[PDB]
Every structure is written in C-alpha cells, then in structure tokens.
mmCIF file of N, CA, C and O in Angstrom:
data_model
loop_
_atom_site.group_PDB
_atom_site.id
_atom_site.type_symbol
_atom_site.label_atom_id
_atom_site.label_comp_id
_atom_site.label_asym_id
_atom_site.label_seq_id
_atom_site.Cartn_x
_atom_site.Cartn_y
_atom_site.Cartn_z
ATOM 1 N N UNK X 52 28.088 -16.929 -19.748
ATOM 2 C CA UNK X 52 26.939 -16.430 -19.215
ATOM 3 C C UNK X 52 26.980 -15.184 -20.453
ATOM 4 O O UNK X 52 27.850 -14.503 -20.204
ATOM 5 N N UNK X 53 25.396 -15.602 -20.858
ATOM 6 C CA UNK X 53 25.188 -14.060 -21.372
ATOM 7 C C UNK X 53 24.569 -13.307 -20.058
ATOM 8 O O UNK X 53 23.767 -13.138 -19.455
ATOM 9 N N UNK X 54 25.395 -11.807 -19.287
ATOM 10 C CA UNK X 54 25.010 -10.867 -18.725
ATOM 11 C C UNK X 54 24.007 -9.831 -18.779
ATOM 12 O O UNK X 54 23.654 -9.620 -18.182
ATOM 13 N N UNK X 55 23.729 -10.222 -20.236
ATOM 14 C CA UNK X 55 22.168 -9.341 -20.836
ATOM 15 C C UNK X 55 20.960 -9.677 -20.628
ATOM 16 O O UNK X 55 20.381 -9.684 -20.360
ATOM 17 N N UNK X 56 21.142 -11.565 -20.580
ATOM 18 C CA UNK X 56 19.930 -12.378 -19.789
ATOM 19 C C UNK X 56 19.730 -11.998 -18.475
ATOM 20 O O UNK X 56 18.708 -11.998 -18.081
ATOM 21 N N UNK X 57 20.534 -12.235 -17.287
ATOM 22 C CA UNK X 57 20.332 -11.854 -15.755
ATOM 23 C C UNK X 57 19.860 -10.827 -16.116
ATOM 24 O O UNK X 57 18.810 -10.695 -15.102
ATOM 25 N N UNK X 58 20.359 -9.304 -16.557
ATOM 26 C CA UNK X 58 20.261 -8.046 -16.297
ATOM 27 C C UNK X 58 18.031 -8.058 -16.384
ATOM 28 O O UNK X 58 17.448 -7.474 -15.642
ATOM 29 N N UNK X 59 17.803 -8.297 -17.819
ATOM 30 C CA UNK X 59 16.482 -8.220 -17.780
ATOM 31 C C UNK X 59 14.942 -9.481 -16.687
ATOM 32 O O UNK X 59 14.546 -8.976 -16.952
ATOM 33 N N UNK X 60 16.142 -10.940 -16.399
ATOM 34 C CA UNK X 60 15.158 -11.394 -16.125
ATOM 35 C C UNK X 60 14.667 -10.460 -14.777
ATOM 36 O O UNK X 60 13.995 -11.116 -13.656
ATOM 37 N N UNK X 61 16.388 -9.849 -13.965
ATOM 38 C CA UNK X 61 16.062 -9.474 -12.470
ATOM 39 C C UNK X 61 14.741 -7.900 -12.698
ATOM 40 O O UNK X 61 14.523 -7.988 -11.891
ATOM 41 N N UNK X 62 15.253 -7.331 -13.613
ATOM 42 C CA UNK X 62 14.369 -6.200 -13.974
ATOM 43 C C UNK X 62 12.822 -7.219 -14.495
ATOM 44 O O UNK X 62 11.561 -5.955 -13.460
ATOM 45 N N UNK X 63 12.227 -8.294 -14.966
ATOM 46 C CA UNK X 63 10.835 -8.572 -15.164
ATOM 47 C C UNK X 63 10.765 -9.159 -13.561
ATOM 48 O O UNK X 63 9.506 -8.871 -12.955
ATOM 49 N N UNK X 64 11.271 -9.737 -12.773
ATOM 50 C CA UNK X 64 11.023 -10.215 -10.854
ATOM 51 C C UNK X 64 10.977 -8.869 -10.381
ATOM 52 O O UNK X 64 9.992 -8.685 -9.762
ATOM 53 N N UNK X 65 11.746 -8.095 -10.333
ATOM 54 C CA UNK X 65 11.384 -6.586 -10.106
ATOM 55 C C UNK X 65 9.915 -5.861 -10.338
ATOM 56 O O UNK X 65 9.493 -5.712 -9.685
ATOM 57 N N UNK X 66 9.823 -6.088 -11.326
ATOM 58 C CA UNK X 66 8.085 -5.528 -11.854
ATOM 59 C C UNK X 66 7.427 -6.077 -11.670
ATOM 60 O O UNK X 66 6.308 -5.593 -11.189
ATOM 61 N N UNK X 67 7.532 -7.745 -11.436
ATOM 62 C CA UNK X 67 6.446 -7.818 -11.160
ATOM 63 C C UNK X 67 6.268 -7.581 -9.428
ATOM 64 O O UNK X 67 5.076 -7.693 -8.846
ATOM 65 N N UNK X 68 7.048 -7.798 -8.652
ATOM 66 C CA UNK X 68 7.777 -7.761 -7.033
ATOM 67 C C UNK X 68 6.469 -6.111 -6.749
ATOM 68 O O UNK X 68 5.720 -6.036 -6.074
ATOM 69 N N UNK X 69 6.720 -5.552 -7.666
ATOM 70 C CA UNK X 69 6.596 -3.763 -7.453
ATOM 71 C C UNK X 69 4.791 -3.777 -7.810
ATOM 72 O O UNK X 69 4.260 -2.524 -6.892
ATOM 73 N N UNK X 70 4.293 -4.341 -8.733
ATOM 74 C CA UNK X 70 3.327 -4.444 -9.309
ATOM 75 C C UNK X 70 2.394 -5.208 -8.333
ATOM 76 O O UNK X 70 1.441 -5.433 -7.888
ATOM 77 N N UNK X 71 2.254 -6.237 -7.632
ATOM 78 C CA UNK X 71 2.094 -7.142 -6.775
ATOM 79 C C UNK X 71 2.111 -6.308 -5.216
ATOM 80 O O UNK X 71 1.111 -6.289 -4.684
ATOM 81 N N UNK X 72 3.327 -5.475 -5.057
ATOM 82 C CA UNK X 72 2.487 -4.704 -3.794
ATOM 83 C C UNK X 72 2.218 -3.453 -3.800
ATOM 84 O O UNK X 72 1.862 -2.523 -3.005
ATOM 85 N N UNK X 73 1.429 -2.695 -4.970
ATOM 86 C CA UNK X 73 0.433 -1.992 -4.745
ATOM 87 C C UNK X 73 -0.634 -1.978 -5.294
ATOM 88 O O UNK X 73 -1.390 -1.231 -4.577
ATOM 89 N N UNK X 74 -1.136 -2.877 -5.650
ATOM 90 C CA UNK X 74 -2.813 -3.382 -5.293
ATOM 91 C C UNK X 74 -3.250 -3.583 -3.757
ATOM 92 O O UNK X 74 -2.631 -3.466 -2.606
ATOM 93 N N UNK X 75 -4.344 -3.303 -3.330
ATOM 94 C CA UNK X 75 -5.152 -2.481 -2.217
ATOM 95 C C UNK X 75 -6.212 -2.728 -2.300
ATOM 96 O O UNK X 75 -6.940 -3.573 -3.255
ATOM 97 N N UNK X 76 -6.595 -3.202 -1.245
ATOM 98 C CA UNK X 76 -8.301 -3.959 -0.717
ATOM 99 C C UNK X 76 -9.279 -2.582 0.209
ATOM 100 O O UNK X 76 -9.049 -2.742 1.350
ATOM 101 N N UNK X 77 -10.541 -1.967 -0.857
ATOM 102 C CA UNK X 77 -11.039 -1.289 -0.304
ATOM 103 C C UNK X 77 -11.951 -1.393 -0.536
ATOM 104 O O UNK X 77 -12.486 -1.429 -1.870
ATOM 105 N N UNK X 78 -13.339 -1.869 0.005
ATOM 106 C CA UNK X 78 -14.810 -2.089 -0.079
ATOM 107 C C UNK X 78 -15.590 -1.202 0.211
ATOM 108 O O UNK X 78 -15.534 -0.298 1.976
ATOM 109 N N UNK X 79 -16.359 -0.385 -0.468
ATOM 110 C CA UNK X 79 -17.815 0.553 0.383
ATOM 111 C C UNK X 79 -19.032 0.252 -0.109
ATOM 112 O O UNK X 79 -19.638 0.986 -0.376
ATOM 113 N N UNK X 80 -19.242 -1.362 1.157
ATOM 114 C CA UNK X 80 -20.265 -1.212 0.608
ATOM 115 C C UNK X 80 -21.672 -0.601 1.628
ATOM 116 O O UNK X 80 -21.310 -0.476 2.186
ATOM 117 N N UNK X 81 -22.939 -1.222 1.573
ATOM 118 C CA UNK X 81 -23.499 -0.372 1.797
ATOM 119 C C UNK X 81 -24.570 -1.134 3.203
ATOM 120 O O UNK X 81 -23.326 -1.814 3.711
ATOM 121 N N UNK X 82 -25.292 -1.207 4.009
ATOM 122 C CA UNK X 82 -25.993 -1.829 5.013
ATOM 123 C C UNK X 82 -26.976 -1.786 4.916
ATOM 124 O O UNK X 82 -28.004 -2.049 3.757
ATOM 125 N N UNK X 83 -27.371 -3.427 5.289
ATOM 126 C CA UNK X 83 -28.410 -3.593 5.273
ATOM 127 C C UNK X 83 -29.430 -3.422 6.110
ATOM 128 O O UNK X 83 -30.723 -3.496 5.657
ATOM 129 N N UNK X 84 -29.859 -2.140 6.862
ATOM 130 C CA UNK X 84 -30.674 -1.460 7.175
ATOM 131 C C UNK X 84 -31.796 -0.880 6.204
ATOM 132 O O UNK X 84 -31.345 0.141 5.079
ATOM 133 N N UNK X 85 -33.280 -1.164 6.528
ATOM 134 C CA UNK X 85 -33.890 -0.444 5.848
ATOM 135 C C UNK X 85 -34.408 0.879 5.621
ATOM 136 O O UNK X 85 -35.080 0.741 7.146
ATOM 137 N N UNK X 86 -34.686 1.301 4.988
ATOM 138 C CA UNK X 86 -35.196 3.231 5.191
ATOM 139 C C UNK X 86 -36.535 2.834 5.192
ATOM 140 O O UNK X 86 -37.323 2.814 4.546
ATOM 141 N N UNK X 87 -37.310 3.576 6.577
ATOM 142 C CA UNK X 87 -38.568 2.951 6.733
ATOM 143 C C UNK X 87 -39.331 5.100 6.272
ATOM 144 O O UNK X 87 -38.909 5.269 6.219
ATOM 145 N N UNK X 88 -40.723 4.395 6.316
ATOM 146 C CA UNK X 88 -41.807 5.846 5.514
ATOM 147 C C UNK X 88 -43.166 6.308 6.600
ATOM 148 O O UNK X 88 -42.494 5.002 7.647
ATOM 149 N N UNK X 89 -43.145 7.039 6.572
ATOM 150 C CA UNK X 89 -44.447 7.205 7.620
ATOM 151 C C UNK X 89 -45.751 6.153 7.354
ATOM 152 O O UNK X 89 -45.520 5.687 6.070
ATOM 153 N N UNK X 90 -46.423 6.125 8.188
ATOM 154 C CA UNK X 90 -47.925 5.106 7.618
ATOM 155 C C UNK X 90 -49.133 5.763 8.765
ATOM 156 O O UNK X 90 -48.902 6.419 9.320
ATOM 157 N N UNK X 91 -50.253 5.389 8.416
ATOM 158 C CA UNK X 91 -51.600 5.598 9.204
ATOM 159 C C UNK X 91 -52.087 4.575 9.814
ATOM 160 O O UNK X 91 -52.372 3.753 8.643
ATOM 161 N N UNK X 92 -52.535 4.606 11.009
ATOM 162 C CA UNK X 92 -53.381 3.445 11.302
ATOM 163 C C UNK X 92 -55.008 3.989 10.388
ATOM 164 O O UNK X 92 -55.256 5.075 10.214
ATOM 165 N N UNK X 93 -55.701 2.297 9.847
ATOM 166 C CA UNK X 93 -57.141 2.897 9.189
ATOM 167 C C UNK X 93 -58.186 2.384 9.996
ATOM 168 O O UNK X 93 -57.659 1.303 11.162
ATOM 169 N N UNK X 94 -58.886 2.999 9.726
ATOM 170 C CA UNK X 94 -59.995 2.779 10.920
ATOM 171 C C UNK X 94 -61.312 1.063 10.252
ATOM 172 O O UNK X 94 -61.766 1.458 8.973
ATOM 173 N N UNK X 95 -60.969 0.465 11.210
ATOM 174 C CA UNK X 95 -62.505 -1.018 10.676
ATOM 175 C C UNK X 95 -63.841 -0.753 11.055
ATOM 176 O O UNK X 95 -64.413 0.060 11.934
ATOM 177 N N UNK X 96 -64.665 -0.995 9.512
ATOM 178 C CA UNK X 96 -66.335 -0.331 10.196
ATOM 179 C C UNK X 96 -66.939 -1.122 11.429
ATOM 180 O O UNK X 96 -66.596 -1.668 11.942
ATOM 181 N N UNK X 97 -67.734 0.356 11.976
ATOM 182 C CA UNK X 97 -68.522 -0.396 13.288
ATOM 183 C C UNK X 97 -69.967 0.334 13.053
ATOM 184 O O UNK X 97 -69.586 0.968 12.453
ATOM 185 N N UNK X 98 -70.932 0.268 13.895
ATOM 186 C CA UNK X 98 -71.719 0.183 14.098
ATOM 187 C C UNK X 98 -71.978 0.701 15.458
ATOM 188 O O UNK X 98 -72.341 -0.299 16.597
ATOM 189 N N UNK X 99 -73.245 1.522 15.977
ATOM 190 C CA UNK X 99 -73.051 2.056 17.355
ATOM 191 C C UNK X 99 -74.922 2.270 17.377
ATOM 192 O O UNK X 99 -75.694 3.222 16.813
ATOM 193 N N UNK X 100 -75.761 1.916 18.233
ATOM 194 C CA UNK X 100 -77.195 1.822 18.617
ATOM 195 C C UNK X 100 -77.304 2.571 20.383
ATOM 196 O O UNK X 100 -76.029 1.950 20.569
ATOM 197 N N UNK X 101 -78.178 3.277 20.445
ATOM 198 C CA UNK X 101 -79.001 2.994 21.532
ATOM 199 C C UNK X 101 -80.205 2.532 21.991
ATOM 200 O O UNK X 101 -80.570 3.357 21.317
ATOM 201 N N UNK V 655 19.116 -28.092 -13.266
ATOM 202 C CA UNK V 655 19.931 -26.915 -13.423
ATOM 203 C C UNK V 655 19.787 -26.044 -12.120
ATOM 204 O O UNK V 655 20.696 -25.020 -11.696
ATOM 205 N N UNK V 656 18.728 -26.361 -10.608
ATOM 206 C CA UNK V 656 19.896 -25.908 -9.758
ATOM 207 C C UNK V 656 20.791 -26.287 -9.471
ATOM 208 O O UNK V 656 21.183 -25.486 -8.518
ATOM 209 N N UNK V 657 21.156 -27.046 -9.458
ATOM 210 C CA UNK V 657 21.850 -28.272 -9.118
ATOM 211 C C UNK V 657 23.358 -27.906 -9.086
ATOM 212 O O UNK V 657 24.331 -27.401 -9.174
ATOM 213 N N UNK V 658 22.952 -27.443 -10.790
ATOM 214 C CA UNK V 658 24.145 -26.900 -11.530
ATOM 215 C C UNK V 658 24.797 -25.565 -10.993
ATOM 216 O O UNK V 658 25.899 -25.478 -10.311
ATOM 217 N N UNK V 659 23.590 -24.859 -10.697
ATOM 218 C CA UNK V 659 23.874 -23.827 -9.860
ATOM 219 C C UNK V 659 23.972 -23.425 -8.473
ATOM 220 O O UNK V 659 25.299 -22.475 -8.578
ATOM 221 N N UNK V 660 23.502 -24.302 -7.689
ATOM 222 C CA UNK V 660 24.232 -24.679 -6.537
ATOM 223 C C UNK V 660 25.991 -24.912 -6.186
ATOM 224 O O UNK V 660 26.308 -24.609 -5.665
ATOM 225 N N UNK V 661 26.120 -25.440 -7.099
ATOM 226 C CA UNK V 661 28.119 -26.385 -7.426
ATOM 227 C C UNK V 661 28.818 -25.467 -7.922
ATOM 228 O O UNK V 661 29.434 -25.321 -8.495
ATOM 229 N N UNK V 662 29.042 -24.149 -7.292
ATOM 230 C CA UNK V 662 29.771 -23.129 -7.562
ATOM 231 C C UNK V 662 29.721 -22.185 -8.496
ATOM 232 O O UNK V 662 30.731 -21.343 -8.857
ATOM 233 N N UNK V 663 28.570 -22.502 -9.402
ATOM 234 C CA UNK V 663 28.428 -21.254 -9.999
ATOM 235 C C UNK V 663 28.197 -19.634 -9.713
ATOM 236 O O UNK V 663 27.208 -19.872 -8.775
ATOM 237 N N UNK V 664 29.206 -18.323 -10.327
ATOM 238 C CA UNK V 664 28.732 -17.335 -9.426
ATOM 239 C C UNK V 664 28.083 -16.801 -9.973
ATOM 240 O O UNK V 664 27.182 -16.911 -11.134
ATOM 241 N N UNK V 665 27.554 -15.972 -9.173
ATOM 242 C CA UNK V 665 26.104 -14.617 -9.519
ATOM 243 C C UNK V 665 26.880 -13.504 -9.948
ATOM 244 O O UNK V 665 28.098 -13.333 -10.282
ATOM 245 N N UNK V 666 25.067 -13.101 -10.963
ATOM 246 C CA UNK V 666 26.502 -11.788 -11.514
ATOM 247 C C UNK V 666 26.823 -10.642 -11.088
ATOM 248 O O UNK V 666 25.789 -10.094 -9.326
ATOM 249 N N UNK V 667 27.953 -10.003 -10.905
ATOM 250 C CA UNK V 667 28.307 -9.078 -9.849
ATOM 251 C C UNK V 667 27.361 -8.097 -9.806
ATOM 252 O O UNK V 667 28.148 -7.704 -8.196
ATOM 253 N N UNK V 668 26.306 -7.249 -10.030
ATOM 254 C CA UNK V 668 25.506 -6.257 -9.463
ATOM 255 C C UNK V 668 24.591 -7.022 -8.578
ATOM 256 O O UNK V 668 24.509 -6.039 -7.655
ATOM 257 N N UNK V 669 24.286 -7.936 -8.010
ATOM 258 C CA UNK V 669 23.913 -8.152 -6.742
ATOM 259 C C UNK V 669 24.776 -8.137 -5.501
ATOM 260 O O UNK V 669 23.917 -7.311 -4.784
ATOM 261 N N UNK V 670 26.064 -7.994 -5.395
ATOM 262 C CA UNK V 670 26.782 -7.720 -4.631
ATOM 263 C C UNK V 670 26.506 -5.737 -4.718
ATOM 264 O O UNK V 670 26.658 -5.076 -3.516
ATOM 265 N N UNK V 671 27.145 -5.434 -5.900
ATOM 266 C CA UNK V 671 26.779 -3.765 -6.161
ATOM 267 C C UNK V 671 25.854 -3.066 -5.391
ATOM 268 O O UNK V 671 25.341 -2.111 -4.777
ATOM 269 N N UNK V 672 24.687 -4.137 -5.302
ATOM 270 C CA UNK V 672 22.741 -3.825 -5.259
ATOM 271 C C UNK V 672 22.833 -3.236 -4.015
ATOM 272 O O UNK V 672 22.950 -2.560 -3.043
ATOM 273 N N UNK V 673 23.453 -4.430 -3.067
ATOM 274 C CA UNK V 673 23.709 -5.038 -2.014
ATOM 275 C C UNK V 673 24.669 -3.682 -1.068
ATOM 276 O O UNK V 673 24.450 -2.980 -0.090
ATOM 277 N N UNK V 674 25.592 -3.537 -2.189
ATOM 278 C CA UNK V 674 26.538 -1.961 -1.474
ATOM 279 C C UNK V 674 25.837 -0.711 -1.374
ATOM 280 O O UNK V 674 26.383 0.285 -0.925
ATOM 281 N N UNK V 675 24.857 -0.837 -2.628
ATOM 282 C CA UNK V 675 24.662 0.999 -3.043
ATOM 283 C C UNK V 675 23.133 0.952 -1.738
ATOM 284 O O UNK V 675 22.719 2.026 -1.403
ATOM 285 N N UNK V 676 22.802 -0.183 -1.425
ATOM 286 C CA UNK V 676 21.076 -0.150 -0.876
ATOM 287 C C UNK V 676 22.109 0.020 0.454
ATOM 288 O O UNK V 676 21.048 1.042 1.402
ATOM 289 N N UNK V 677 22.726 -0.052 1.460
ATOM 290 C CA UNK V 677 23.452 1.221 2.509
ATOM 291 C C UNK V 677 24.069 1.841 2.126
ATOM 292 O O UNK V 677 23.154 3.112 3.185
ATOM 293 N N UNK V 678 24.349 2.938 1.128
ATOM 294 C CA UNK V 678 24.106 4.177 1.023
ATOM 295 C C UNK V 678 22.970 4.762 0.696
ATOM 296 O O UNK V 678 22.655 5.997 1.250
ATOM 297 N N UNK V 679 21.930 4.142 0.594
ATOM 298 C CA UNK V 679 20.564 4.448 -0.100
ATOM 299 C C UNK V 679 20.371 5.055 1.857
ATOM 300 O O UNK V 679 19.341 6.062 1.881
ATOM 301 N N UNK V 680 20.333 4.192 3.000
ATOM 302 C CA UNK V 680 20.031 4.619 4.155
ATOM 303 C C UNK V 680 20.635 5.761 5.008
ATOM 304 O O UNK V 680 19.680 6.336 5.448
ATOM 305 N N UNK V 681 21.786 5.980 3.911
ATOM 306 C CA UNK V 681 22.531 6.765 5.279
ATOM 307 C C UNK V 681 21.911 8.381 4.977
ATOM 308 O O UNK V 681 22.368 9.613 5.555
ATOM 309 N N UNK V 682 22.283 8.404 3.082
ATOM 310 C CA UNK V 682 21.510 9.469 2.744
ATOM 311 C C UNK V 682 20.251 9.397 2.288
ATOM 312 O O UNK V 682 20.270 9.894 1.052
ATOM 313 N N UNK V 683 19.263 10.416 2.580
ATOM 314 C CA UNK V 683 18.281 9.950 2.157
ATOM 315 C C UNK V 683 17.767 11.423 0.998
ATOM 316 O O UNK V 683 17.175 10.887 0.397
ATOM 317 N N UNK V 684 18.122 12.098 1.382
ATOM 318 C CA UNK V 684 17.653 13.505 0.607
ATOM 319 C C UNK V 684 18.311 13.309 -0.689
ATOM 320 O O UNK V 684 17.945 13.927 -1.313
ATOM 321 N N UNK V 685 19.447 12.518 -0.195
ATOM 322 C CA UNK V 685 19.774 12.659 -1.646
ATOM 323 C C UNK V 685 19.174 11.678 -3.281
ATOM 324 O O UNK V 685 19.259 12.332 -4.406
ATOM 325 N N UNK V 686 18.300 11.037 -2.200
ATOM 326 C CA UNK V 686 17.592 10.093 -3.142
ATOM 327 C C UNK V 686 15.874 10.877 -3.676
ATOM 328 O O UNK V 686 15.048 9.688 -4.265
ATOM 329 N N UNK V 687 15.578 11.914 -3.039
ATOM 330 C CA UNK V 687 14.228 12.460 -2.462
ATOM 331 C C UNK V 687 13.376 11.940 -2.171
ATOM 332 O O UNK V 687 11.959 11.486 -2.458
ATOM 333 N N UNK V 688 13.872 11.321 -0.546
ATOM 334 C CA UNK V 688 12.496 10.952 -0.046
ATOM 335 C C UNK V 688 13.255 11.476 1.416
ATOM 336 O O UNK V 688 14.065 11.443 2.050
ATOM 337 N N UNK V 689 12.168 11.257 2.563
ATOM 338 C CA UNK V 689 11.900 11.797 4.439
ATOM 339 C C UNK V 689 11.342 10.322 4.824
ATOM 340 O O UNK V 689 10.273 10.043 4.475
ATOM 341 N N UNK V 690 11.665 10.424 5.629
ATOM 342 C CA UNK V 690 11.300 9.151 6.341
ATOM 343 C C UNK V 690 10.397 9.801 7.180
ATOM 344 O O UNK V 690 8.921 8.993 6.995
ATOM 345 N N UNK V 691 9.701 10.666 7.699
ATOM 346 C CA UNK V 691 8.374 10.827 8.232
ATOM 347 C C UNK V 691 7.990 12.691 8.365
ATOM 348 O O UNK V 691 9.403 13.450 7.694
ATOM 349 N N UNK V 692 7.114 13.492 8.524
ATOM 350 C CA UNK V 692 6.740 14.503 8.732
ATOM 351 C C UNK V 692 5.577 14.768 9.609
ATOM 352 O O UNK V 692 5.103 14.098 9.961
ATOM 353 N N UNK V 693 6.459 16.178 10.373
ATOM 354 C CA UNK V 693 6.172 16.392 11.414
ATOM 355 C C UNK V 693 4.789 17.348 11.507
ATOM 356 O O UNK V 693 4.822 18.384 10.929
ATOM 357 N N UNK V 694 3.338 17.450 11.944
ATOM 358 C CA UNK V 694 2.199 18.444 11.719
ATOM 359 C C UNK V 694 2.014 18.630 12.725
ATOM 360 O O UNK V 694 1.389 18.161 13.574
ATOM 361 N N UNK V 695 1.782 20.641 13.114
ATOM 362 C CA UNK V 695 1.761 21.034 14.127
ATOM 363 C C UNK V 695 1.732 22.223 13.744
ATOM 364 O O UNK V 695 1.296 22.709 13.020
ATOM 365 N N UNK V 696 0.865 22.907 15.436
ATOM 366 C CA UNK V 696 -0.191 24.360 14.688
ATOM 367 C C UNK V 696 0.951 25.521 15.767
ATOM 368 O O UNK V 696 0.417 26.660 15.194
ATOM 369 N N UNK V 697 2.036 24.661 16.680
ATOM 370 C CA UNK V 697 3.267 26.026 17.416
ATOM 371 C C UNK V 697 4.362 25.557 16.830
ATOM 372 O O UNK V 697 4.695 24.708 17.899
ATOM 373 N N UNK V 698 4.862 25.458 15.499
ATOM 374 C CA UNK V 698 6.464 25.205 15.181
ATOM 375 C C UNK V 698 7.450 25.672 15.969
ATOM 376 O O UNK V 698 7.575 26.838 16.273
ATOM 377 N N UNK V 699 8.976 25.318 16.785
ATOM 378 C CA UNK V 699 9.846 25.547 17.605
ATOM 379 C C UNK V 699 10.947 25.446 16.366
ATOM 380 O O UNK V 699 11.502 24.155 16.393
ATOM 381 N N UNK V 700 11.632 26.483 15.730
ATOM 382 C CA UNK V 700 12.794 26.076 15.037
ATOM 383 C C UNK V 700 13.751 25.543 15.549
ATOM 384 O O UNK V 700 14.252 25.739 16.396
ATOM 385 N N UNK V 701 14.840 25.157 15.014
ATOM 386 C CA UNK V 701 15.631 24.206 15.243
ATOM 387 C C UNK V 701 16.876 25.336 14.932
ATOM 388 O O UNK V 701 17.351 26.218 14.110
ATOM 389 N N UNK V 702 17.517 25.746 16.344
ATOM 390 C CA UNK V 702 18.648 27.121 16.241
ATOM 391 C C UNK V 702 19.937 27.459 15.444
ATOM 392 O O UNK V 702 20.434 27.769 14.963
ATOM 393 N N UNK V 703 20.021 25.773 14.578
ATOM 394 C CA UNK V 703 21.481 25.596 14.625
ATOM 395 C C UNK V 703 21.437 25.684 13.606
ATOM 396 O O UNK V 703 22.461 25.657 12.750
ATOM 397 N N UNK V 704 20.393 25.218 12.335
ATOM 398 C CA UNK V 704 20.222 25.764 10.806
ATOM 399 C C UNK V 704 20.018 27.125 10.607
ATOM 400 O O UNK V 704 20.406 27.727 9.385
#
C-alpha cells in the first residue's frame, strides 16, 4: 500500500466533516402584522328644515 | 474492495496513534490552548492554593 494516499483521504474526509459542522441556521424574518395609520370619519350630506 | 479490506487487510498505523493521542488531549487542556468553561461573576473569590 502507498501510505501517502491514506493520509490524503483522511485529511479530505476530516476537512469535509469540519466544513459540514460549521453551517449555522439563523433566520431573521419580519412579522405579518401591518402598521396602522390615523384616519378621520367623514360627514355625509344632510338637510335640516323646521 | 470492501470484502478485500475486511479480510485481514491492516489499517494505517496513524489510526491507533490518533486514538492514543486523543486521550492525551483530554487530560491536559491548556497544553493545546482550550478551556472547558468560563465563569462570569461580580464578586470573585480567589483560590488560596495558587
């Protein structure tokens, strides 16, 4: 056996495992709530007589 | 190839070397520049022995 291929294979598999073990899962999504604004009731036309 | 390897084909000596060195790593942490845990506190109490 060529002892220099085993070392390279071990290094490669160790690098793969180390790379796979650093990935993090973090999400910073917003919320579905809607910001509300001010409003004023409007007046419908009316007629007054006595 | 898997059957060929299982039938008495010996592993590269480094396997046992790493297994034996990992035990050394556990027993003396600060020789390899790592600490298991840290304590954050506002009123520290010194260890008199040191």
